Amino acid sequence: AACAGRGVRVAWREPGRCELNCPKGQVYLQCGTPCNLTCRSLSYPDEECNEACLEGCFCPPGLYMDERGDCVPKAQCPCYYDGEIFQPEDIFSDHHTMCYCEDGF
Amino acid sequence: HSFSIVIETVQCADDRDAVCTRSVTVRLPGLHNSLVKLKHGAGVAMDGQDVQLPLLKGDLRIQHTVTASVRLSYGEDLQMDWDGRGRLLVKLSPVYAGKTCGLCG
Amino acid sequence: HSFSIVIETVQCADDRDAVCTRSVTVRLPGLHNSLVKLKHGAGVAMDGQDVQLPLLKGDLRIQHTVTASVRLSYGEDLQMDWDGRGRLLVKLSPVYAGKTCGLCG
Amino acid sequence: DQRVSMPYASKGLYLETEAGYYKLSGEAYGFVARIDGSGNFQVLLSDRYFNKTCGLCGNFNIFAEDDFMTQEGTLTSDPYDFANSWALSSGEQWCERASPPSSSC
Numbered sequence A: 001a002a003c004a005g006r007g008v009r010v011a012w013r014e015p016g017r018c019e020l021n022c023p024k025g026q027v028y029l030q031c032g033t034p035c036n037l038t039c040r041s042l043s044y045p046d047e048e049c050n051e052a053c054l055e056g057c058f059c060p061p062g063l064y065m066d067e068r069g070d071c072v073p074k075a076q077c078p079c080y081y082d083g084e085i086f087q088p089e090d091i092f093s094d095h096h097t098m099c100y101c102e103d104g105f
Numbered sequence B, C: 001h002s003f004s005i006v007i008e009t010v011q012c013a014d015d016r017d018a019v020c021t022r023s024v025t026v027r028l029p030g031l032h033n034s035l036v037k038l039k040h041g042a043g044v045a046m047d048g049q050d051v052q053l054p055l056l057k058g059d060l061r062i063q064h065t066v067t068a069s070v071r072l073s074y075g076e077d078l079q080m081d082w083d084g085r086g087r088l089l090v091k092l093s094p095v096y097a098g099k100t101c102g103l104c105g
Numbered sequence D: 001d002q003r004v005s006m007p008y009a010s011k012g013l014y015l016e017t018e019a020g021y022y023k024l025s026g027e028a029y030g031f032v033a034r035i036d037g038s039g040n041f042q043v044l045l046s047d048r049y050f051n052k053t054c055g056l057c058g059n060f061n062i063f064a065e066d067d068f069m070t071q072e073g074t075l076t077s078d079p080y081d082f083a084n085s086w087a088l089s090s091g092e093q094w095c096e097r098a099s100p101p102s103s104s105c
């Protein structure tokens, strides 16, 4: 981590020492981007994110990650609105507004 | 005024006839006028703060059921069970017989 | 007195030499004297309320990193990263240079 | 689900191959429908339904700007919002949210 802080990345993990056994189908990456991993990123796309890459467990390139840690296509992400979690294709209408959840937004 | 339960209803589809409960709100004056909110998706907030579950706080006890439904208990005389999709079951001990008011009678 | 970080150290094995940090406590006087506690296992409490993440509350932001480590931010000038097992990294912007005090110098 | 042959007449509805195009007349109900040889639909609706109808054909009042009323009772500037608001599902076909297709121009 100190090396990475100085911008040097070392592939030091190996089967004989300290492999990250990632949950479920997530894939270990030595340099992955955190900005667009979770489906909340879909629900809040205008929240700016410029964070550098980091090692960890990430979903495959075509899938986002939900609350359960399961990798899902963006069509299956829930939508977060006013702090409430709505399922895909959910619709609601209020005195003031009409909304519907699609593709995590 | 031991408790006070309020439901927020929204149109839940395109049809005018499709109206279902989005969120539930519970005042507990005897618990220093706490305000619990049971949200869509079975999240819980207390005094506006999203709380991690289970919550034990005096008489109040909020926890996930095996069905993933939030079960709220307060004392032994009041209980609630919120599935997050729109189903709410409120159970009162006989202690509240005749004392109750609202849509539930 | 923009902030104040305290660590709770316990013996972490049978050996007298094995002492590691169990929990972290952060006071934020500007945020109405909020008292965040980063707990073992990467949980978080705020003013004693266990809280559900991500938390956005004024300048304070708390969220899970891809490593499952809790990352706390307060404005631009203070950041923390707590893995829950005993590793804590505190990053201050140059705004605090010379102003700091404690074990970190 | 039972197939029938033209011409067909029942319960006030008349299916006829008028002028080489499949007609479906509803004089009693105040409407006439037609499908031409190329698949273009047609609906003629009597004056009795002035300002009393709603659907993809819009309401029927000479003001054209207000034809996009959704089933929720609100106008929308997007044709697809309006149309999807007027979708109808069945026990063997549940409607997906339609969206504009990709195109070259």
Ligand SMILES: *[C@@H]1O[C@H](CO)[C@@H](O)[C@H](O)[C@H]1NC(C)=O
Pocket: A033, A036, A037, A060, A061, A062, A063, A064
């Ligand atoms: C996230 O961003 C990266 C880099 O910009 C991109 O390769 C990837 O396709 C994006 N989406 C997901 C789900 O990772």
Ligand SMILES: *[C@@H]1O[C@H](CO)[C@@H](O)[C@H](O)[C@H]1NC(C)=O
Pocket: D051, D061
């Ligand atoms: C049509 O119906 C609406 C809604 O009831 C009403 O406000 C309006 O006066 C009616 N007539 C016309 C010409 O729009």
Ligand SMILES: [Ca+2]
Pocket: D058, D059, D060, D061, D062, D063, D064, D065, D066, D067
């Ligand atoms: Ca019109």
